[PDB]
Design an enzyme around this catalytic site. Structure first.
Site, PDB file in Angstrom:
ATOM      1  CG  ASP A  35      60.348  18.286  25.457  1.00 19.52           C
ATOM      2  OD1 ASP A  35      60.024  19.105  26.344  1.00 19.52           O
ATOM      3  OD2 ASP A  35      61.230  18.509  24.606  1.00 19.52           O
TER       4      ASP A  35
HETATM    5  N1  LIG Z   1      58.814  11.992  17.246  1.00 16.33           N
HETATM    6  C1  LIG Z   1      59.241  12.735  16.243  1.00 16.33           C
HETATM    7  O1  LIG Z   1      59.235  12.353  15.087  1.00 16.33           O
HETATM    8  C2  LIG Z   1      59.780  14.140  16.566  1.00 16.33           C
HETATM    9  C3  LIG Z   1      60.328  15.032  15.581  1.00 16.33           C
HETATM   10  C4  LIG Z   1      60.840  16.339  15.899  1.00 16.33           C
HETATM   11  C5  LIG Z   1      60.764  16.741  17.252  1.00 16.33           C
HETATM   12  N2  LIG Z   1      60.199  15.878  18.245  1.00 16.33           N
HETATM   13  C6  LIG Z   1      60.078  16.302  19.642  1.00 16.33           C
HETATM   14  O2  LIG Z   1      61.142  15.745  20.476  1.00 16.33           O
HETATM   15  C7  LIG Z   1      60.679  15.435  21.797  1.00 16.33           C
HETATM   16  C8  LIG Z   1      60.892  13.947  22.018  1.00 16.33           C
HETATM   17  O3  LIG Z   1      60.467  13.507  23.317  1.00 16.33           O
HETATM   18  P1  LIG Z   1      61.563  13.188  24.450  1.00 16.33           P
HETATM   19  O4  LIG Z   1      60.932  12.780  25.687  1.00 16.33           O
HETATM   20  O5  LIG Z   1      62.605  12.238  23.967  1.00 16.33           O
HETATM   21  O6  LIG Z   1      62.176  14.630  24.621  1.00 16.33           O
HETATM   22  P2  LIG Z   1      63.628  15.341  24.435  1.00 16.33           P
HETATM   23  O7  LIG Z   1      63.738  14.623  23.151  1.00 16.33           O
HETATM   24  O8  LIG Z   1      62.962  16.613  24.773  1.00 16.33           O
HETATM   25  O9  LIG Z   1      64.156  14.557  25.715  1.00 16.33           O
HETATM   26  C9  LIG Z   1      65.498  14.073  25.630  1.00 16.33           C
HETATM   27  C10 LIG Z   1      66.022  13.410  26.894  1.00 16.33           C
HETATM   28  O10 LIG Z   1      67.148  12.559  26.682  1.00 16.33           O
HETATM   29  C11 LIG Z   1      68.315  12.963  27.416  1.00 16.33           C
HETATM   30  N3  LIG Z   1      69.533  12.364  26.863  1.00 16.33           N
HETATM   31  C12 LIG Z   1      70.270  12.713  25.762  1.00 16.33           C
HETATM   32  N4  LIG Z   1      71.319  11.864  25.614  1.00 16.33           N
HETATM   33  C13 LIG Z   1      71.220  10.999  26.609  1.00 16.33           C
HETATM   34  C14 LIG Z   1      72.014   9.909  26.930  1.00 16.33           C
HETATM   35  N5  LIG Z   1      73.065   9.580  26.197  1.00 16.33           N
HETATM   36  N6  LIG Z   1      71.704   9.128  28.035  1.00 16.33           N
HETATM   37  C15 LIG Z   1      70.638   9.425  28.805  1.00 16.33           C
HETATM   38  N7  LIG Z   1      69.880  10.480  28.481  1.00 16.33           N
HETATM   39  C16 LIG Z   1      70.130  11.287  27.397  1.00 16.33           C
HETATM   40  C17 LIG Z   1      68.164  14.492  27.519  1.00 16.33           C
HETATM   41  O11 LIG Z   1      68.794  15.181  28.643  1.00 16.33           O
HETATM   42  P3  LIG Z   1      70.415  15.313  28.963  1.00 16.33           P
HETATM   43  O12 LIG Z   1      71.001  15.922  27.702  1.00 16.33           O
HETATM   44  O13 LIG Z   1      70.486  16.346  30.092  1.00 16.33           O
HETATM   45  O14 LIG Z   1      70.897  13.955  29.280  1.00 16.33           O
HETATM   46  C18 LIG Z   1      66.646  14.563  27.708  1.00 16.33           C
HETATM   47  O15 LIG Z   1      66.247  14.520  29.086  1.00 16.33           O
HETATM   48  C19 LIG Z   1      59.219  15.957  21.837  1.00 16.33           C
HETATM   49  O16 LIG Z   1      59.206  17.336  22.327  1.00 16.33           O
HETATM   50  C20 LIG Z   1      58.800  15.917  20.343  1.00 16.33           C
HETATM   51  O17 LIG Z   1      57.687  16.756  20.019  1.00 16.33           O
HETATM   52  C21 LIG Z   1      59.726  14.576  17.897  1.00 16.33           C
END
Ligand SMILES: NC(=O)c1ccc[n+]([C@@H]2O[C@H](COP(=O)([O-])OP(=O)(O)OC[C@H]3O[C@@H](n4cnc5c(N)ncnc54)[C@H](OP(=O)(O)O)[C@@H]3O)[C@@H](O)[C@H]2O)c1
Ligand SMILES: NC(=S)c1ccc[n+]([C@@H]2O[C@H](COP(=O)([O-])OP(=O)(O)OC[C@H]3O[C@@H](n4cnc5c(N)ncnc54)[C@H](O)[C@@H]3O)[C@@H](O)[C@H]2O)c1
EC number: 7.1.1.1
Lengths: 362, 174, 366
Positions: free
Chosen positions: B103
């Site tokens: 994201d």
């Molecule tokens: N920062 C905060 O405090 C907070 C709080 C609430 C919400 N958020 C939101 O969460 C998002 C965070 O950014 P982000 O880039 O990390 O986005 P995501 O959280 O949208 O991205 C997660 C990535 O990690 C992968 N993943 C999960 N387990 C994995 C593993 N074991 N090994 C390799 N890959 C794995 C997922 O795909 P697969 O499952 O297909 O592997 C995915 O591509 C933002 O949209 C943000 O607004 C952030």
């Protein structure tokens, strides 16, 4: 043979010279162990736990020493004039071991010499490599360095670690530690854990290496295990590059010490005046004068926007961990002289571990 | 409609660069790949390559999520940068190693005005020569929208676990 | 136009709604920034430090607010019914931005409505990706999760990390965090970096993964694999009996805090333990906690400080001033120095509580 551990009665002291683990070992050596009821409450060591370990529980302190062949304590007994004769309880002719504090407590030494009492001052332990396991200064210093960072983090109004947030970046705290000995090394470690950029300096050159290995940067300047006075010439050359980092520092922990001589001033009132507002100074040498004249034993002092902390007996602030370790230092010091099935003690003396410690073997 | 790719490939692409910036995300945390990741960086900057971490304020699931995990792996502070202080450098970067991040890069934040991730600032990963991702599957992230960056000319999809997919790359990196 | 930042009056509030970095922005956006004297003191933001940024220093709150077009505060302004009429100081028709507590403090909202003040309650920010930088709920809670650990360390008689010494070994401390929101998550991270074994437990299923993404260990029953499962609290009690520090972060808007650690449970805890109840102002997660103090029963210390974010005032305030600014900037444009809150904006519609002489937010009897 009997050994007793009383409850600490001095203001603040929450440590106790015992633990469940250490009773087991003492028992197997032929010792009858009596502990004072409620003595381990400040260190979380319960009465129930000590009994299961084989010791016995005494109603009163007086009853605990009544028939004691050997008495273990943390802090020196309160002399008759101190407010309660403890030296008067310890049965005559027995042996005492504790942080009697020889040198600066000449009287308590004679009160024991009059009760025909043999006492061992654990803080005089030689700096030999085979005694590290029986050194109470070290086992306590170490915890003191941890608790310093804790106390610093407490008094500090900012967070320690860097955190990049959607609302902006909260920068890492910048810590600077004067004196990289036991207490200082641990202060560096714990500080590095919470995510702070750590800065350090010491006169002993063999330090710089250790600092760099823990993750901190060394502020370069320029005995049988320690140091001595450096001279006005150095102190001035010192506050040199220190300044560059001291005016950027948020937490400053002073642990500098020099035997038989006043604790070395490293942060003058003219330097505290230049520190960022809201900064904190943890003075661990406060009871030896302090490394910063503004610090006052037993209380926190705010002056010029900087908070100067100077708690006393910091190790007691970490009582539950400090005590087990203290009890073991004593065990390691005594165990080598308990002639296996005879149940009698004899202090080697030829062994400097008994000589460098025995103040009065009357 | 989506190009694939394995470790050996990903080892190649990156092993042939002069400037490389890592972009950690939640994924890198769930797999606890900080130490592996930090290796693939010091073995990388060994050749003489330049390395940097692009930290997006909202990576992971809580403020400073990426920071604490990088700090544990012992990656230096002066090498970790916040979106706003590095978002430009991607252009002059060959590889955009996106480990566990999704994201935080999706372009639907500047375009597609109706996306849940709309208006939110992102990292200019695409401006990087080649963008290597990493993720167990195709599922989206917290947002619930697909990443048009996933399937397009210069994009890699190393499907798998962040710790493993990095673990091997470090190996076929010798 | 003119924007002013007063000093926080509520007891114990050390924070301040401004920062040197933010004044420079407000000026650059066209504003004349005024802030009461001694306003940033508890936050280590001096007047000089502030003036140097472009701010003027009014001597009293009244003089600061007198003719300000926009007003910034952290906690809601006090009313006459509380002993001090602060909304009386705010110019009629002005704009107020702060943590109002609107949905739960209709009186202040009425006070503001009588003076035709447009009030934007920051706590009502829409949960949307583009308002993450405008969310005070997470920037403050995050610091509180951090501080919960620091207080717990401070109160605990043992060190967090395991230590192997020449004199012996001391085991690490065991921390159990109840509730895994922003706060609880930062507590896990802070407790784990300090070297403790950290266990956590939250109702929301999807949590287990977040907790492990921080080295935590989720408390799950293993009667099998992922009719009355209310016996999971046996696995939660299993850990509690071995815990040194328990930190509870569970809260629910408007409603009382859910009891997570009964009195019955605390009796089962080992002496020397401490419970940090960050939910103490909403009733607590532990019925033995008392707003503003460290009670002690069964050998367990029950810590209940109020306004934890304020205990990290020096970092909390600049973050808060940032949220505020990030919320405002999108509305200050050319127009020869004039802000206009596009009513279309969801950030404006979900946060605006009352507008020029009339309550506006639905949930408020109008
Ligand atoms: N920062 C905060 O405090 C907070 C709080 C609430 C919400 N958020 C939101 O969460 C998002 C965070 O950014 P982000 O880039 O990390 O986005 P995501 O959280 O949208 O991205 C997660 C990535 O990690 C992968 N993943 C999960 N387990 C994995 C593993 N074991 N090994 C390799 N890959 C794995 C997922 O795909 P697969 O499952 O297909 O592997 C995915 O591509 C933002 O949209 C943000 O607004 C952030
Ligand atoms: N049983 C044995 S063998 C033993 C026991 C304890 C400590 N040690 C060793 O002794 C060293 C230190 O011990 P310690 O207990 O921490 O000593 P202590 O606590 O007395 O010394 C604190 C620190 O003060 C430093 N210091 C003193 N004056 C100055 C000054 N003007 N400027 C800067 N620094 C100054 C000094 O060099 C030391 O590192 C370590 O390297 C230990 O290894 C050995």
């Amino acid at each position: 043979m009997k050994i007793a551990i009383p409850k600490e009665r001095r203001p603040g002291e929450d440590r106790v010279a015992i633990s469940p683990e250490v009773v087991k070992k003492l028992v197997g050596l032929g010792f009858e162990v009596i502990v004072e009821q409620g003595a381990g409450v400040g260190a979380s060591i319960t009465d129930d736990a000590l009994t299961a370990a084989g010791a016995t529980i005494a109603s009163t302190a007086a009853q605990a020493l009544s028939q004691a062949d050997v008495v273990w304590k943390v802090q020196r007994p309160m002399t008759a004039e101190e407010g309660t004769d403890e030296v008067a309880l310890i049965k005559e002719g027995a042996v005492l071991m504790c942080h009697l504090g020889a040198l600066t407590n000449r009287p308590v030494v004679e009160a024991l010499t009059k009760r025909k009492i043999t006492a061992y001052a654990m803080e005089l332990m030689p700096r030999i490599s085979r005694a590290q396991s029986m050194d109470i200064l070290s086992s306590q210093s170490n915890l003191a360095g941890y608790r310093a960072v804790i106390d610093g983090a407490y008094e500090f109004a900012r967070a320690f670690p860097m955190m990049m947030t959607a609302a902006g970046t909260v920068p890492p705290a910048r810590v600077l530690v004067f004196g990289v000995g036991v207490a200082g090394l641990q202060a560096i470690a714990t500080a590095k854990r919470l995510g702070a950029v750590v800065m350090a300096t010491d006169v002993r050159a063999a330090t710089k290496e250790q600092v760099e290995s823990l993750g901190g940067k060394f502020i370069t300047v320029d005995a049988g295990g320690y140091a001595k006075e450096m001279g006005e010439e150095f102190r001035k050359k010192q506050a040199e590059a220190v300044l560059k980092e001291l005016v950027k520092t948020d937490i400053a922990i002073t642990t500098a010490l020099i035997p038989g001589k006043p604790a070395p001033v490293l942060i003058t009132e003219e330097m505290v005046t230049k520190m960022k507002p809201g900064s904190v100074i943890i003075d661990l040498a406060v009871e030896a004068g302090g490394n910063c004249p503004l610090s006052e034993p037993g209380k926190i002092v705010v002056k010029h926007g900087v908070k100067i902390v100077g708690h006393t007996n910091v190790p007691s602030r970490v009582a539950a961990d400090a005590s087990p370790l203290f009890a073991k230092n004593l065990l390691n010091f005594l165990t080598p002289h308990v002639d296996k099935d005879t149940k009698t003690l004899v202090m080697k003396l030829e062994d400097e571990t008994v000589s460098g410690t025995c103040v009065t073997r009357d | 409609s989506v190009k694939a790719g394995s470790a050996e490939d990903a080892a190649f692409i990156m092993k042939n660069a002069s400037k490389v910036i890592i972009v950690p995300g939640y994924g890198m945390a769930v797999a606890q790949a900080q130490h592996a990741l930090r290796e693939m960086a010091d073995v990388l900057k060994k050749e003489g390559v330049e390395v940097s971490y692009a930290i997006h304020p909202v990576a992971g699931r809580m403020p400073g999520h990426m920071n604490v995990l990088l700090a544990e792996a012992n990656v230096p502070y002066d090498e970790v940068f916040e979106l706003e202080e590095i978002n430009s450098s991607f252009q002059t970067a060959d590889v955009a190693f996106v480990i566990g991040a999704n994201d935080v890069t999706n372009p639907a934040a500047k375009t597609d005005p109706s996306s849940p991730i709309y208006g939110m600032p992102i990292l200019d990963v695409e401006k990087a020569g080649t963008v290597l991702f990493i993720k167990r599957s195709m599922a989206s992230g917290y947002a619930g929208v697909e990443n048009e960056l996933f399937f397009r000319n210069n994009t890699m999809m190393l499907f798998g676990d962040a710790k493993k997919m990095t673990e091997q790359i470090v190996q076929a990196m010798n």
